[PDB]
Homo-oligomer: 164 residues x 5
């Protein structure tokens, strides 16, 4: 049923991890849903670029041969894959300011913790790294060693938020 | 005939009841009209998120297994389901100001009264809760005990509005 | 061939006669062109609302049963169907200002004269009601009793406009 | 394959020759490409108007019977078909200012010369009417009687432009 | 499956090399992917122009007979194909300013070097022409004669960028 005719999601070259990962996941998901072969998918790839990136594709066209190589090359030229110590310094710089919802803080911190190499941290030390930066509006009620998984922190945060 | 190819309605994370309920009802209605199966509908769900929420979906992907569970989880993480006393204080705070149409006031107050638990109020006390906040431009003509249902209030409000 | 999948024309609740009549005529025309049945058309109606009006449709869903009833209810809740004397006062308030084209004035005045009940006025008194408000730039050349229909007024107005 | 479902090009009523001619040519071209019959094309015409013009179509609906009559009526009510002496005064009013490209000047002047009645001018006097208003940056090099057609003027203008 | 029905990419007449080359490559790629014949593709070409360029197409319609001739004519009337010495003066005018990423500089300089006639320069002198304008933030670490191809320059530039 077609092969990359037209869609809303495009890519520009904004040089950030979130936009690049969102675009790659959306394209990779669309290919699986619509059911397009691997050889037919690479011919339609300049139908998505609209910016500086199409000038980037006019030069590096002869380096790609398969779909996985082109996707890894798009991940390599733009996502700079920052090292570990900048991430560990970026988590401890900004505390949770007053009058901010729990869910935005938790999803931003989880998206920041996903950048580390996989298999290096469990769930328990993951929650222990995040339990040291919350406001005293939430730390007065729920103590440590009672919340065992990463869902129960939000489950008890939404109760104190409604109570005020 | 396809399975969530592309559409105008998307979701961002605006943290409000009206936008979330509108998006969920529009998606739930589109699934019923187009005739898509339940197993095929969950594979196409990241084609709708475009914001902070796609970073939220990159983390909580392994918690969803059926369509109803994913819809209830999207209702739970964003719509905060406010308690009763804040609603009963929010209805009595703002009176109807001068030079405002009847229909906007009635639809906003009905959308505010839908947040209570279902089966707790009849139609008569529902109209009795709304008849105490209207302007004297409308309360001089129509008295109580004459309007029995919730349609006749608008039916007699549109007559006095045309008369001026 | 589908049933209200996606389209550009939507409705918000702007509270005016022109936008409501345009939206209703466009939807009614699209249903006739595409060839959709009456029972299939009502299931897809919340795919068009995008505003306050979808909160209005979450409350008055159980009042509609057929397509004509829903269309008349949408005409009733928003188009206020103003009385006659306000129209007859609105026609005689604004004269035709200098340096304005004939066609805009004629189409606006015809759209204002359509609001009266049908069958109350002929063509001759219709032109007699409009011939008293034009500029002396056009009334110096063409006199009364020479223009018999409503097309010849524009036909002789476009000649004097080109001449200047 | 459908009959005027939805498209980007619409019409508003901007009262100019270029926008009206572009819209009419695009619609006339789309009808020929998609292959739609003449009786099916007139039912879908209010799906394109979005402005004051739809109020204009609610009044003059009963005057159209064929496609050519409706197209000529749309050309008549909006394009005012200016007389000859205003065109001959409009060509000689604005000279070519300094630092402006040749191609924009030539295409604008050709679009202005198309408004005259057809068959009144050859190619030679057409170029003779345009050779009297160019800058001395171009008239120092190429003389008259050497450029015979209307293409060689641009062909020798692009050479002097690159040279500077 | 259709023949140029509607798409996002259009052309205006912006008079620059990048936008024209992007539009031509996107159209040429779409024709190859969708599988449209050469005779059917030329009838649908005024469905893409939306600007001054459609007035340009109303005049030069009778000069095109095949697809390749129309594409070369669109490349000729707008892309001015600048001479060599302006390019060789444009490369050496702007050095790499401080705090700018390597990839943007490399892709812009490659897109500028593509304008020369093909077959005039190898890869080695191509890298030698670009190695004289970089910042001392990168020239302190990597010396000449160690980087042999044009990929290893970026491969060693991304390492020093992460290190800081």
């Amino acid at each position: 049923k077609g092969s990359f005719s037209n869609c809303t999601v495009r890519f520009s070259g904004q040089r950030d991890h979130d936009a690049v990962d969102e675009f790659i996941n959306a394209v990779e998901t669309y290919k699986e849903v619509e059911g397009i072969s691997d050889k037919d998918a690479l011919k339609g790839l300049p139908l998505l670029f609209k910016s500086i990136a199409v000038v980037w594709w006019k030069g590096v066209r002869r380096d790609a041969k398969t779909w996985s190589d082109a996707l890894q090359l798009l991940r390599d030229h733009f996502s700079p894959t920052k090292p570990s110590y900048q991430i560990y310094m970026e988590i401890f710089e900004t505390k949770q300011s007053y009058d901010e919802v729990i869910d935005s803080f938790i999803c931003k911190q989880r998206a920041l913790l996903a950048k580390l190499p996989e298999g290096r941290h469990d769930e328990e030390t993951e929650l222990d790294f995040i339990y040291g930066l919350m406001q005293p509006k939430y730390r007065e009620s729920i103590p440590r060693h009672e919340v065992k998984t990463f869902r129960e922190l939000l489950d008890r945060g939404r109760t104190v938020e409604r109570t005020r």
